[PDB]
Amino acid sequence: DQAGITGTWYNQLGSTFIVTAGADGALTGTYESAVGNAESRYVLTGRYDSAPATDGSGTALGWTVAWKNNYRNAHSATTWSGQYVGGAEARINTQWLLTSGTTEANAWASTLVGHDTFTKVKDQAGITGTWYNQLGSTFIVTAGADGALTGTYVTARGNAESRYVLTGRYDSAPATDGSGTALGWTVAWKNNYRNAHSATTWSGQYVGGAEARINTQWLLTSGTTEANAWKSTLVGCDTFTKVK
Amino acid sequence: DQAGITGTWYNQLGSTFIVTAGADGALTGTYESAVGNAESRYVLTGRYDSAPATDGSGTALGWTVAWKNNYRNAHSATTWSGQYVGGAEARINTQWLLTSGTTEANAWASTLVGHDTFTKVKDQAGITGTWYNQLGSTFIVTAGADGALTGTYVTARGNAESRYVLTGRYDSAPATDGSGTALGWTVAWKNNYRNAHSATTWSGQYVGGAEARINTQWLLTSGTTEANAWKSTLVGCDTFTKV
């Protein structure tokens, strides 16, 4: 829960994840990566299921880091999708997508995938607006000047109805060689009407111009028992356009 | 290397992988899963980089299991994409995609993703033919009556030229409810002309009819040093059509 997630987490690479869980399902914090084109802290935002099922399954959650701070710009964003498991050896088991901004020629090679285990020991104008994917889903987002993404997601498919809060990050200083703009965001599939004990992260890049698009891959993690943890995470791809 | 890979491997779930690596980059064997809708042995086929680099990096490889045998049909296929790392604690580090045959309505929810670590210590007619993806790549495949897939792959993109061998598996007895047919295959990016020290696995489903498709997700693993292992694997999606 909130008390369970809030705190400092360490992964198998030596990265440090500092997070506060809000009563409302918010995740806010800083990420410090021991590997890659990274240095010092980066802002992270995400969501978690603030009312997980009480059958001993984990708590679905997700979060995004855009790899830009005052010192470094790696023209990339990672999203982690996973579940928090509580108790004496508390864990956040995740899968992650790392998208780099690329030319359209290199887009097929844009996205790394991996797994991280966390333990408690050891432009703006372009993106802001309404987007529509091939499923009929609607993504309403405001890009902040500081790399924030905030808005609501409405899915035409799955155990979803009405709007869900979304938070994420984008590279607010993309390279100006015609590369896309790396970004990601999370929805926890809980609102006032439904709780699907799950969270999706989208990792992708915004491409501008006459046919602007946001090309993404996503991870959907469900809260599971440890028995079913191997079958907790769906993967897919969504293409968003500004026209339905 | 061939000698390093050949043998019995065990993962964190208690599954057993028995494999023979051929001198030609072939992987053949049986998989026994400790979890899921699986019992007894299932055929596996795949490929590996038979000429990895000698800078200490792992050896790219992948393989497929279609979850059909004489006792069980789970209308699914898993592809593992990873690298073999040799020495005293030999490992195969993988990511996997498990695609289930679904209706078009449920296709968005068809594919699971995970990671497995292995240690040495504990529609035949529809599919057969030429397929083209959105990148301009060409996939030529023969589906065997037994769930085999064999053929060649020619990629319009990446560190690739001419044909590469492909092997894989499909559900040779999907359900009679309009679901797609689960399948997967592997290409190791080595031929007589090029070695890209990498292997791709496609996991997906064949949908038949007037606009037949193979909808896939893929994992591309490069051989890396242990320091670069975190950045070894690309993920994407390819749609293949007959046109």
For residues A200 and A139, state if they share a domain. Answer: yes
Q: Which residue has the tokens 């073999």?
A: B84
Q: Using the beta-carbon criterion (under 8 Å), do A13 and B230 form an inter-chain contact?
A: yes
Task: Based on the fold, state whether residues A183 and A159 are members of the same structural domain.
Answer: yes
Residues in chain A whose beta carbon is closer than 8 A to a beta carbon of chain B?
A: 13, 35-36, 95, 97-98, 105, 108-109, 111-115, 135, 157-158, 217, 219, 227, 230-231, 233-237
Tokens read off for A108: 């097929």
Tell me the C-alpha distance between A55 and A75, whole Å: 41
Q: Are residues B5 and B48 in the same domain?
A: yes
Do both B110 and B191 map to the same domain?
no
Technique of determination: X-ray
Amino acid at B103: T
Six-digit token string for B208 = 């038949």
| A221 exposure class (CB count in 10 Å sphere: 0-12, 13-18, 19+) | buried
Q: Domain limits at A41? A: 1-122
The domain tally of chain A equals 2
| Same domain membership, residue A91 and residue A143 | no
Q: Final residue of a domain: which of A122, A137, A154?
A: A122
Helix, strand, coil percentages in chain A from 3-state DSSP, rounded to 5: 5, 55, 40
Name the domain boundary from B99, B122, B145. Answer: B122
> Is the domain of A115 the same as that of A167?
no
Give DSSP secondary structure letters for A104-132: STTGGG-EEEEEEEEES---HHHHSEEEE
| Statement to judge: residues B98 and B171 lie in one domain | no
Q: Are B167 and B199 in the same domain? A: yes
Partner-chain contact A36 B135, CB within 8 Å: no
Q: Quote the minimal CA–CA distance from B173 to chain A in Å.
A: 23
Same domain, B113 and B19: yes
**Sign of the Cα pseudo-torsion (A27, A33, A36, A42, in order):** positive
Distance, in Å, from the CA atom of B63 to the CA atom of B82, rounded to the nearest integer, reads 9
Among residues B72, B96, B122, the one where a domain terminates is B122
User: In angstroms, how far is CA A166 from the centroid of its own chain?
Assistant: 9
Nearest residue to A34 via CA among A22, A26, A42: A42
d(CA B219, CA B199): 8
What distance in Å separates the CA atoms of residue B114 and residue A234, rounded to the nearest whole number? Answer: 9
Q: State both tokens at A43.
A: 């802002």
Handedness of CA A16, A20, A21, A26 (dihedral sign): negative
Q: What is the CA radius of gyration of chain B?
A: 17
Q: CA B167, B242, B171: angle at the middle one, nearest 5?
A: 45
The amino acid at residue B231 is K
Residue environment code for A105-144, b if the CB has 16+ CB neighbours within 10 A, otherwise e: eebbebbbbbbbebeeeebeebbeeebbbeeebbbebebe
Contacts of A230 in chain B (CB under 8 A): 13, 35-36, 114
Q: Is the domain of B68 the same as that of B174?
A: no
> Of A131, A171, A128, nearest to A150 (Cα)?
A128
B35 → closest Cβ in A105, A111, A230: A230
Whether residue A194 sits in one domain with residue A208:
yes
Half-sphere exposure of B194 (CA within 13 A, CB side): 15
Helices (H), B91-180: 124-127
Nearest to B237 among A36, A231, A237 (CB): A237
Sheet strands (E) in A23-136: 26-32, 42-48, 59-68, 73-85, 91-100, 111-119, 129-133
- Considering the domain architecture, whether residues B77 and B115 belong to the same structural domain is answered as yes
